[PDB]
Design a protein around this ligand. Structure first.
Ligand SMILES: Nc1ncnc2c1ncn2[C@@H]1O[C@H](COP(=O)(O)OP(=O)(O)O)[C@@H](O)[C@H]1O
Ligand SMILES: [Mg+2]
Lengths: 148, 274, 91, 182
């Protein structure tokens, strides 16, 4: 029970100082999930706004670094798995041949969930061009996502 | 989006669980789903198809691929889920499947057969070899309408034989071909028509839509009252008009493969029996 | 024109465009044969589908024998019997 | 058309009339159906006047009476409305249990039993078989596909936010790489 090691807190300070283009020692609320999903915990938007509304009852728009250590210490135990991701793309594969359809994958990634924009799914089809067009090897794709 | 029985139910899609159950609560169900223009209505693995008599747009290839590998209880009731279930039991279970399309004349059995077989050749995934097979079956459909279907008093294009269109796959899923097979051609309609009906309307097509030299060399006469096999009191039928349907059928015969001496010979035999 | 050349063990998906009950106000021999092949058609429902339900249901260890069905073998026996049929007395 | 007219083909039998011919054609049809699985279309016309709106009640009640549909509804209320084997049912439906999703849960029939005991499904609704899993009612699968779609919306939100995480990780590695690391 550390709960965070010293080199990891040094990585939080390095990422917090690197992402801060304002130079004021704090960031906004709309880009805190950019840092937290750059570090790779993958929370949701509603839980993130729940924690921002929990630490800020006035809407200041400033995020502190000990508050960020408290949030990332809370999100330390939230560890996902590659197998639930893999079985999820097996479910969305309606065929069972390992090659999920890129147009149906676009329909899932745009028309179901939090309704992503054209540019991110355009980056997803452009990333699946090496498996496309029309077919997507999800088994290679989840290993290209969850490699680092 | 899609019509779903899961969220926002419309009537009941499956009538087997519809209670209270009588004739009246079932005709009220068909009237209710005919109101919302949802014509297909399951009884489980049995599909009710009410004739809309108009182009309902849900037959697109997006509906075809949309219903591909979808069970009975995920979507709205539609014929592509039964056709796709029988394609699943053909493909995965490796055993023969048949679809028996019944109902009154003029309800749309032949059209529903064309839509079933169009779906089957669509979701087979081998769209290069199966296309000309499907196309010769579909373009052979109005030919068999002309030579095998006639006007009863109820319908105007009543089905008077058992058509049976096959599509034939390998166990590796390769389309070999397809065999069409007649059953129970009503022979005695050729010689007697019961007082409100008319003969197989290829005689009316041959005596209406044919050129004068073709009437001359087939030794026929355009008067419908000359021929004992040919009714006059029920000869004229609106809608399906005694018209240029003949050149539609003959052009379809050209599509299927009949040469001009071949189709000329066929019309000559039709003139001999007439 | 479309024949299974180099014929092998194949599998078939078929479509039967067959009528329904042509029940006309003045029925004849033709509507008799029509209603008859409807009787054989319901016999190929009540034989194939209902009896595969029964061998399936009983075979998968569930204790049913569903309540009753009106079998059509009595009507086939009325018409296609070689001695007591209706078609046989017409022959 | 007529190979019977060959004098080298002495066909001496009398002509079969029509019960022989049509009955033999029905027997040929039954030869071409008993080897197959049937799946039915029952087709209904609303009126004879070819109308797209007018729905005559008496003609359709005629056709309901003689297509044998209420007897069909009675027969299909025997015990079931749905049947499947175990393994594609557990593979398709394992997301609704916390334990079977995503892996696995062995054995197949037992994890199926945990799946039906997880959603508080009544014992009257399902039934257990030897090699197949079985469901009586259509509204049961309406509920199971409803909860399945509600599960797949959360799962699609999960996949979209993990793709946002890999995207922001890619921009983080690009931002780290474009800072002239000595
Ligand atoms: N599903 C359908 N959608 C639209 N029109 C239909 C449909 N079924 C039948 N029809 C109409 O019915 C006419 C022919 O019906 P048909 O299939 O010949 O009936 P049957 O097979 O009972 O003789 C066509 O002109 C068509 O306009
Ligand atoms: Mg027809």
């Amino acid at each position: 029970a550390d709960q965070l090691t010293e080199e990891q807190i040094a990585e939080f300070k390095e990422a917090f100082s690197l992402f801060d283009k304002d130079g004021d020692g704090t960031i906004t609320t709309k880009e805190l999930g950019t840092v937290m999903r750059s570090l790779g915990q993958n929370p949701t938007e509603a839980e993130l706004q729940d924690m921002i509304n929990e630490v800020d009852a006035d809407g200041n728009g400033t995020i502190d670094f000990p508050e960020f250590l408290t949030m990332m210490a809370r999100k330390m135990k939230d560890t996902d798995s590659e197998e639930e991701i893999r079985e999820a793309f097996r479910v969305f594969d309606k065929d069972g041949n390992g090659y999920i359809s890129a147009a149906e994958l676009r329909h899932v990634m745009t028309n179901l969930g939090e309704k992503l924009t054209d540019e991110e799914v355009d980056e997803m089809i452009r990333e699946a061009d090496i498996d496309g067009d029309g077919q997507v090897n999800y088994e290679e794709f989840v290993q290209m996502m969850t490699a680092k | 989006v899609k019509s779903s029985l899961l969220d926002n139910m419309i009537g009941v899609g499956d009538t087997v669980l519809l209670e209270p159950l009588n004739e009246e609560t079932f005709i009220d169900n068909l009237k209710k789903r005919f109101d919302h223009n949802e014509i297909y209505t399951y009884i489980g693995s049995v599909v009710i198809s009410v004739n809309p008599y108009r182009s309902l747009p849900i037959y697109s290839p997006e509906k075809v691929e949309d219903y591909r590998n979808r069970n009975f209880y995920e979507l709205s009731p539609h014929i592509f889920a039964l056709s796709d279930e029988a394609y699943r039991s053909l493909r995965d279970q490796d055993k023969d499947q048949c679809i028996l399309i019944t109902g009154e004349s003029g309800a749309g059995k032949t059209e529903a057969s064309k839509l079933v077989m169009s779906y089957v050749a669509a979701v087979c995934g081998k769209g290069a070899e199966v296309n000309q097979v499907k196309e010769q079956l579909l373009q052979s459909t109005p030919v068999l309408e002309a030579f095998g279907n006639a006007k009863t008093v109820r319908n105007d294009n009543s089905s008077r034989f058992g058509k049976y269109m096959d599509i034939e796959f390998d166990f590796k899923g390769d389309p070999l071909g397809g065999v069409i097979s007649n059953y129970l051609l009503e022979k005695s309609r050729v010689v007697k028509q019961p007082r409100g009906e008319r003969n197989f309307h290829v005689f009316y097509q041959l005596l209406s839509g044919a050129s004068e030299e073709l009437l001359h060399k087939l030794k026929l006469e355009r008067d419908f009252s000359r021929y004992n096999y040919l009714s006059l009191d029920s000869a004229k039928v609106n809608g399906v008009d005694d018209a240029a349907n003949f050149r539609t059928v003959r052009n379809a015969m050209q599509i299927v493969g009949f040469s001009d001496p071949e189709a000329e010979s066929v019309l000559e035999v039709v003139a001999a029996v007439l | 024109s479309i024949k299974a050349q180099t014929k092998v063990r194949k599998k078939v998906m078929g479509v039967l465009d067959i009528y329904g009950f042509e029940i006309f106000e003045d029925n004849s021999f033709e509507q008799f044969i029509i209603n008859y092949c409807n009787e054989k058609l319901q016999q190929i429902f009540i034989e194939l589908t209902l009896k595969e339900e029964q061998e399936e249901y009983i075979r998968e260890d569930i204790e049913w024998t569903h309540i009753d069905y009106f079998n059509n073998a009595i009507i086939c026996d009325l018409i296609e019997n070689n001695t007591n049929g209706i078609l046989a007395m017409l022959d | 058309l007529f190979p019977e007219g060959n004098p080298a083909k002495v066909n001496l039998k009398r002509p079969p009339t029509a019960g022989s011919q049509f009955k033999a054609s029905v027997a040929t049809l039954m030869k071409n159906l008993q080897t197959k699985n049937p799946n039915y279309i029952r087709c209904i016309k609303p009126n004879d006047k070819k109308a797209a709106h007018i729905f005559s009640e008496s003609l359709v009640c005629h056709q309901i009476r003689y297509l044998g549909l209420l007897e069909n509804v009675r027969v299909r209320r025997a015990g079931y409305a749905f049947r499947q084997a175990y393994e594609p049912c557990l593979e398709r439906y394992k997301m609704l249990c916390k334990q079977t999703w995503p892996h696995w849960k062995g054995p197949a029939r037992s994890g199926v039993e945990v799946l039906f005991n997880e959603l508080e499904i009544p014992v009257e609704e399902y039934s257990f078989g030897r090699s197949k899993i079985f469901i009586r009612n259509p509204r049961t699968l309406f509920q199971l596909e409803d909860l399945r779609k509600q599960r797949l919306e959360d799962l699609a939100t999960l996949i979209q936010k993990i793709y946002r995480g890999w995207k922001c990780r890619t921009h983080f590695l690009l931002m780290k790489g474009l800072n002239d690391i000595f």
